[PDB]
Amino acid sequence: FEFPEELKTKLQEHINYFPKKRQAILLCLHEIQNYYGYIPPESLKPLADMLELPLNHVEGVVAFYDMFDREDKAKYRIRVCVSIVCHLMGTNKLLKALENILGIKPGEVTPDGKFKIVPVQCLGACSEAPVFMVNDDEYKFESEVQLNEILSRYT
Amino acid sequence: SYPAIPRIYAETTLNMLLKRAKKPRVHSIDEYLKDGGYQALEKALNMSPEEIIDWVDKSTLRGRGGAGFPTGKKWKFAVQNPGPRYFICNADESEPGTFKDRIIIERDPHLLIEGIIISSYAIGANEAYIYIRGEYPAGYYILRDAIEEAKKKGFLGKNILGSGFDLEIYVARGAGAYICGEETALIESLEGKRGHPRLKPPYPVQKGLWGKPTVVNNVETIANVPFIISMGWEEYRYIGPSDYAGPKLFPVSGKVKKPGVYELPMNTTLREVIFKYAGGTLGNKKVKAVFSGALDCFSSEELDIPMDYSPLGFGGTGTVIVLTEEDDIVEAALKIAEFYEHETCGQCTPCRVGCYEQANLLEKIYKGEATEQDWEGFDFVNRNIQPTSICGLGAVAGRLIRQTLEKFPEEWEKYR
Numbered sequence: 321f322e323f324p325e326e327l328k329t330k331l332q333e334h335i336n337y338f339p340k341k342r343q344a345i346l347l348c349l350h351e352i353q354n355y356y357g358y359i360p361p362e363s364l365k366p367l368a369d370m371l372e373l374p375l376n377h378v379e380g381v382v383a384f385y386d387m388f389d390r391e392d393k394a395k396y397r398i399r400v401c402v403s404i405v406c407h408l409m410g411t412n413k414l415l416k417a418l419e420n421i422l423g424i425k426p427g428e429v430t431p432d433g434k435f436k437i438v439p440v441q442c443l444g445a446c447s448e449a450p451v452f453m454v455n456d457d458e459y460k461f462e463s464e465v466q467l468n469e470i471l472s473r474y475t
Numbered sequence: 476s477y478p479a480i481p482r483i484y485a486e487t488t489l490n491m492l493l494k495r496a497k498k499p500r501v502h503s504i505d506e507y508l509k510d511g512g513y514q515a516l517e518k519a520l521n522m523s524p525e526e527i528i529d530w531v532d533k534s535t536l537r538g539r540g541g542a543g544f545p546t547g548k549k550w551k552f553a554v555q556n557p558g559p560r561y562f563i564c565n566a567d568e569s570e571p572g573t574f575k576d577r578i579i580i581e582r583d584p585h586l587l588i589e590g591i592i593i594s595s596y597a598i599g600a601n602e603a604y605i606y607i608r609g610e611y612p613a614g615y616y617i618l619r620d621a622i623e624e625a626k627k628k629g630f631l632g633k634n635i636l637g638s639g640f641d642l643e644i645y646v647a648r649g650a651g652a653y654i655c656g657e658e659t660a661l662i663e664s665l666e667g668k669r670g671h672p673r674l675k676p677p678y679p680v681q682k683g684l685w686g687k688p689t690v691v692n693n694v695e696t697i698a699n700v701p702f703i704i705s706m707g708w709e710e711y712r713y714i715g716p717s718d719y720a721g722p723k724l725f726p727v728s729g730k731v732k733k734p735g736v737y738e739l740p741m742n743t744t745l746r747e748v749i750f751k752y753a754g755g756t757l758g759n760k761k762v763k764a765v766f767s768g769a770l771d772c773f774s775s776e777e778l779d780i781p782m783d784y785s786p787l788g789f790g791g792t793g794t795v796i797v798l799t800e801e802d803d804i805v806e807a808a809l810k811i812a813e814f815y816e817h818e819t820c821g822q823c824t825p826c827r828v829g830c831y832e833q834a835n836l837l838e839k840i841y842k843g844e845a846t847e848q849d850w851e852g853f854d855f856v857n858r859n860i861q862p863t864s865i866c867g868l869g870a871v872a873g874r875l876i877r878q879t880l881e882k883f884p885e886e887w888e889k890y891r
């Protein structure tokens with residue numbers, strides 16, 4: 321396996337960013353997931369070599385940090401907060417609306433590999449509960465009609 | 476162009492930490508400079524590091540990350556050890572109900588940056604870090620851009636403003652682990668490893684990043700540093716009560732009419748936070764409980780306590796989650812149990828098994844599928860997560876749930 325030049329350049333940029341190469345591990349993994357829509361298991365070996373780290377170390381790091389997904393490829397990750405404030409304010413209403421629009425439940429991917437619902441702990445926007453993210457973008461859920469309009473922006 | 480951020484409501488009675496951050500938008504270097512920004516840095520570079528530590532010590536600034544340790548004293552402890560030294564800004568946030576740090580990061584990044592430069596100068600650190608949770612991508616891009624602006628204006632790099640002081644601020648991203656907010660697990664993550672906490676002592680000020688003296692401070696703590704230098708420690712100490720001085724951010728959520736961040740003095744009571752500032756409860760319903768993040772639970776009888784770091788005070792990070800009369804306390808306790816179950820790093824056996832069992836048995840109780848043994852097991856597990864624990868997570872994973880059991884016995888009894 322080989323990374324495309326547009327990704328390799330970005331990974332080398334992160335590797336050259338911190339004083340020590342190994343400190344760039346999480347920035348590199350975020351970059352791999354943003355490019356592929358998941359962490360391809362094949363990417364770990366060339367990443368380990370670039371970081372000058374053993375494969376076992378990299379594998380352990382990917383498994384520890386739960387933002388990284390090695391199982392499902394998805395263009396857009398819908399991160400739904402399932403913590404205390406959002407639960408109290410309407411997480412279930414948000415999940416019901418997501419199921420009506422996309423036909424999927426948490427942990428599932430749409431048949432076109434477009435959306436995955438990812439249940440997550442507090443996203444730190446509790447005053448705007450129930451909270452959800454669509455990749456890097458973050459929103460307060462208001463209603464199904466409002467949610468439908470937000471999701472239509474992700475093509 | 477940055478990723479979308481919800482527009483969190485912000486209100487201040489002090490116009491300090493929220494002077495700019497009360498407006499839901501990025502304030503760049505020119506706008507910051509127009510307010511007299513980076514002038515406290517200029518004043519600090521004309522002072523000795525030892526004098527800055529003394530001013531910060533005399534200001535009475537205490538850590539805003541949850542433990543309330545005196546900041547000036549933490550710096551003193553670091554500087555007694557030989558260099559090189561490292562400065563770390565803890566921007567992991569992630570505790571349920573807490574959204575105070577992101578509003579400084581996303582709206583007034585230069586206030587934080589200026590604080591980092593002054594603090595790094597005070598402890599003789601030439602390398603500083605911001606460790607921001609992975610779920611704050613906009614905050615990360617805002618900080619990277621603001622650091623570049625600061626570099627371009629000569630506030631960062633080598634020989635800053637001809638002082639002979641060198642500094643580079645690196646921005647690291649977390650990737651889902653709440654435990655990476657614990658300062659030693661944060662250090663492990665910065666070293667490119669799994670976020671596994673290390674036993675304290677040694678405290679980071681003795682052996683931290685690369686085993687070197689390291690100061691770890693919360694975003695909100697650091698945002699106070701330009702004010703201490705700008706006003707002087709005496710005028711800073713005039714804000715709020717003299718024993719718990721300075722501005723404090725209060726993230727208020729749940730069943731309030733006006734949820735958001737409030738900048739208030741620490742002599743404000745919990746009752747005043749809810750009713751005088753957050754506009755009272757939704758539907759004017761009675762307050763049942765206040766969850767201080769995932770740490771404490773206060774009943775409606777405890778609303779008159781001060782929002783300070785005193786023994787009988789609110790403490791924590793000033794995180795206010797309001798629950799009203801119709802909110803199920805057992806259902807609420809289950810969400811707190813699920814949080815700790817998901818976030819234990821698993822190094823310590825009673826924390827690993829205890830966080831899992833507390834949530835698993837509480838789910839059974841809530842769904843009405845629990846046996847008499849599951850009930851007694853839950854009570855025992857809740858009291859036994861703490862033994863042998865390396866860090867604060869294992870020590871507090873059963874704290875809030877135990878308080879709900881003691882303060883709301885009647886409600887827990889219904890589920891039997």
Ligand SMILES: NC(=O)c1ccc[n+]([C@@H]2O[C@H](COP(=O)([O-])OP(=O)(O)OC[C@H]3O[C@@H](n4cnc5c(N)ncnc54)[C@H](O)[C@@H]3O)[C@@H](O)[C@H]2O)c1
Pocket residue numbers: 538539540541542543544549552567568569570573656657658675678679680691770791792866867
């Ligand atoms: N903000 C959040 O996300 C969050 C999350 C969970 C818990 N909390 C809070 O975190 C607290 C526990 O955190 P902690 O384990 O870092 O607290 P701590 O009591 O161990 O120490 C707090 C700070 O003071 C320093 N310190 C303490 N004793 C020292 C000594 N003798 N010498 C030198 N430095 C010393 C520590 O290194 C640390 O930076 C709890 O009280 C809780 O309220 C906050």
Ligand SMILES: Cc1cc2nc3c(=O)[nH]c(=O)nc-3n(C[C@H](O)[C@H](O)[C@H](O)COP(=O)(O)O)c2cc1C
Pocket residue numbers: 537538539540541542543544565566567568569570653654655656657658659691692693694696697866867868
């Ligand atoms: C499990 C756990 C999570 C923590 N998370 C954070 C956090 O997100 N931000 C923070 O600044 N401190 C957090 N802390 C406290 C830090 O370990 C540390 O006390 C703090 O960063 C020191 O800064 P301060 O003195 O300015 O408060 C956490 C502690 C524990 C036990």
Ligand code: SF4
Pocket residue numbers: 654671672818819820821822823824826827864865866867868869870
């Ligand atoms: S107490 Fe829990 S979170 Fe802390 S080091 Fe031990 S297992 Fe990890």
Ligand code: FES
Pocket residue numbers: 401402403404405406407441442443444445446449451571572573
């Ligand atoms: S509880 Fe959902 S954002 Fe905090």
Ligand SMILES: [Cl-]
Pocket residue numbers: 373374375376
């Ligand atoms: Cl190897």
Ligand SMILES: [Cl-]
Pocket residue numbers: none
């Ligand atoms: Cl104004």
Ligand code: NA
Pocket residue numbers: 567569607608609649650651652653654655656
């Ligand atoms: Na994290």
